[PDB]
């Protein structure tokens, strides 16, 4: 709604999350970049001590 885009018709069980679709469909760099970070923000498995 902020960017005037049609409401996302998201299918339950879609392989992609809503943020992953929005990342491709959002042309604003800041919003898209934050969306990309949220999509790829993961824990790092590391052996410590």
């Amino acid at each position: 709604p902020a960017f005037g885009m049609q409401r996302m018709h998201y299918r339950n069980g879609d392989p992609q999350t809503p943020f992953q679709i929005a990342e491709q469909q959002i042309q604003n760099f800041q919003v898209a970049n934050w969306l990309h970070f949220v999509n790829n923000n993961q824990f790092r498995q590391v052996v410590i001590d």
Binding site: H9, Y10, R11, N12, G13
Partner: protein, 49 residues
Amino acid sequence: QFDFRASMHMLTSNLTFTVYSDLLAFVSADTVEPINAVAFDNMRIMNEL
């Protein structure tokens, strides 16, 4: 004139059979889980979360 020999006819029929009325009585039908019910396009009828 009544001619007994000429009036004798061998009537033929089936020895025995059984007649049934409601064919669908012999069919037990169920439906898939409605969450997974598909439409003509092989997609689920309803997809909103």
